[PDB]
Each structure stands twice: as C-alpha cells, then as structure tokens.
Amino acid sequence: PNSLDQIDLLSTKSFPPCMRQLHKALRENHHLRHGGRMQYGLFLKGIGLTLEQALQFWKDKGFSYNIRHSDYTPFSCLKIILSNPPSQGDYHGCPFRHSDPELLKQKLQSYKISPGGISQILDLVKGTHYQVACQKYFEMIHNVDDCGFSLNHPNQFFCESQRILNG
Amino acid sequence: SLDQIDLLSTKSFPPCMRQLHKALRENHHLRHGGRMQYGLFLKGIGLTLEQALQFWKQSYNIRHSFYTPFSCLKIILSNPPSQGDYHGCPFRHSDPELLKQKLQSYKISPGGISQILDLVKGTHYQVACQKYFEMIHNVDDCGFSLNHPNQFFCESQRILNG
Ligand code: SF4
Ligand code: SF4
C-alpha cells in the first residue's frame, strides 16, 4: 500500500487531461463519486496499479485512498466522451468535451500551455475534435511536433507518453 | 521478494527482460550489463531491484520505489553480450537455433516461430518482438510501433487488465 501522492508527478507528466483532473480532485477532496472512482480507478488498473478506497477509524467523508502494484474494463476515449456525462458533484468525463470552453481555457492556462497551443486546442474543440485537441495537448506537453499515433484511449496516451519520456 | 514477479515476467516482459529475470532467479546474480538493463526496466515500472545485506556484519529483493530505462536501439546496437552476460536483445543476440528453442519453451506455435525467424533474418528485430507480443496476447495486430521494452510492458498491462 502506498499514498496517492507518489504519482503526483506522474499525473502531470503522463496522464491525459481527463485522468489528471481526477487525480487532482481525489487529492484535494479525499474522495470521488462513483463515476470518478470508475474512470480513474480503471485507468490505474490498466497501468497495473490497484486503487484502494478505505474508511478511516475516526469517521469530510473520512475516506483515505492508496495504491499498490496489482472484472471491469478501462474506459476508452469514446466511452468517456459519449456516455456518463458528469453531473455537478462529478469530476469525471473528458475536459475537451465536457468543460465549458471558458473553464477549459483556464484549466489549460493553469497547465502552462502556450497561448498559441491553447488557441489551437480551443479551435479543435469548437469542431468537436476532442481527441485531436488531446493529441495537441500531448504534443505541447512532451514538446514534439507530431505525437505519432491516433489517440483513442487514455491508457494509450499514458504508454505513448512514457515511451517518449523513456527515450 | 524477487519471486513475486515470476508470473508477471512471463506475461508482460519483453524477451530481453524475461531472460534477465530468469537468469537472476537461477544464477542468484547478474553482471553489471545485466543488472543495469533489467534494474532500469524495473525502475520504469516502479520497482527497485536491490541486494539485502545485514547491517550488523562488518538475496535479491524488489520493492516499490520510494534512472532512464534502456530503449530497444540502445540494447540492440550497443554492448553485445559476452559469455557470462545475459543482457541484450534475444532477437539480435541469440543464435537463431537457440532463439527457436527459447520460443518453443515460451509455447509459441511452430508457425509463430517461423514468422519470427524470418523477420530476425531480415534484421527486423523490433517487428519480430511485436510479432511475439501479438502471439502471447492473442491479438492480430498490436497497434503500436515498438521501440522500448517499457512500452512493451505498458502495452501488455493494458491487454491483461482489459
Ligand atoms: S481525449 Fe480521450 S484521453 Fe484525452 S482527455 Fe478526452 S478522454 Fe481523456
Ligand atoms: S525488441 Fe526491444 S523489447 Fe523486444 S526484446 Fe529486443 S529489446 Fe527487448
């Protein structure tokens, strides 16, 4: 068992916007509603990590989460984009599809993306080209001109990001 | 304990690291070239390989980490192994008859083996490795372009936990 904070750096470097957001929310709120627990939990499962939810003796909902090295299937991009739209207490979904563009812009700014980077992303989103906007985000983040793959799965994003960071 | 990943090694490690694990388990030691290739791979998956000692004096273990892993080209192009060394890329470094025997022991089908040998003969080491990935995961097309042992692992984990 290990704390979720062991993968803070990893989320920033290799997690797609949709999992990055869930990691953040889990870390700041100490919980996630079902949709989030599924999307994020299953993503981690795909990498080979087991997320564990626990209730602390003193019970703030009073949960604590951990992870360890290791049923349901990790969600693809189309699954995330097209089904289970997030409600107000929810942090799941795809921020390209689900975030109001003003709020998406502010998230992307907090991520230190360039204005030209942001502007290309927002134009792709207007077009409903969510996955291509996410490749664009992959390119900005890894500082490469062509991601070189056709994005269709948050788990693929991770493997492809790691492969670049691994040389 | 290093034996906790014996199973994982058969299911998701590329040939090159699966042989390092087997040799470390059998030989209770690996030379530097081997320790670096396998140790860094493990680091890439979030594990630290170390030897346990007794602090009170004047066994290889693995644990969660509390280091850039070698790529396919780095392994293939450099440091050919000597006798006594278990590092490198089997596709490039093993005698084809010994590679055939290793694949048989991995339960690759006769047809699978022939495809892999043909590819090795043309020097398409990575593509042979992709063919091996496809056969051990029973998928017709791996869908990615392989250039790093940690990528092989990462992609295997997606399938296995799918
Ligand atoms: S595109 Fe696929 S991966 Fe990128 S964020 Fe939307 S869902 Fe997650
Ligand atoms: S190809 Fe890359 S991964 Fe497959 S074995 Fe040779 S080195 Fe290891």
Curated annotation (Swiss-Prot), chain B:
Signal sequence, renumbered to the chain: none
Sequence segments annotated as region (RNA:DNA duplex-binding): 29-147
Residues involved in [4Fe-4S] cluster binding: C16, C72, C89, C129
Region Interacts with PRIM1: start-end pairs: 1-162
Entry domain remark: The RNA:DNA duplex-binding domain interacts with the template phosphates at positions -2, -1, 1, and 2 positioning its bases -1, 1, and 2 for duplex formation. Interacts only with the beta- and gamma-phosphates of triphosphate moiety of initiating NTP of the primer. The side chain of His-32 mimics a RNA base that would be paired with the template nucleotide at position -1 via a hydrogen bond, thereby facilitating the stacking of the initiating NTP.
UniProt similarity note: Belongs to the eukaryotic-type primase large subunit family.
Subunit structure as annotated in this protein's UniProt entry: Heterodimer of a catalytic subunit PRIM1 and a regulatory subunit PRIM2, also known as the DNA primase complex. Interacts via (C-terminus) with PRIM1. Component of the alpha DNA polymerase complex (also known as the alpha DNA polymerase-primase complex) consisting of four subunits: the catalytic subunit POLA1, the regulatory subunit POLA2, and the primase complex subunits PRIM1 and PRIM2 respectively. Within the complex, POLA1 directly interacts with PRIM2.
General function of this protein: Regulatory subunit of the DNA primase complex and component of the DNA polymerase alpha complex (also known as the alpha DNA polymerase-primase complex) which play an essential role in the initiation of DNA synthesis. During the S phase of the cell cycle, the DNA polymerase alpha complex (composed of a catalytic subunit POLA1, an accessory subunit POLA2 and two primase subunits, the catalytic subunit PRIM1 and the regulatory subunit PRIM2) is recruited to DNA at the replicative forks via direct interactions with MCM10 and WDHD1.
Name of the protein: DNA primase large subunit
Species, as recorded: Homo sapiens (Human)
Parent-record interval covered: 272 to 457 of 509
